[PDB]
Structure formats: structure tokens, C-alpha cells
């Protein structure tokens, strides 16, 4: 969940 949000931005 960490790295989604990560990635995402």
C-alpha cells in the first residue's frame, strides 16, 4: 500500500 501511493504520485 505504501509503494501505491508511491507510484500514483
Same mark, same amino acid.
Given at each position: /500500500? +505504501? +509503494?501505491?501511493? +508511491?507510484? +500514483? /504520485?
Amino acid at each position: /500500500l +505504501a +509503494a501505491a501511493l +508511491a507510484q +500514483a /504520485l
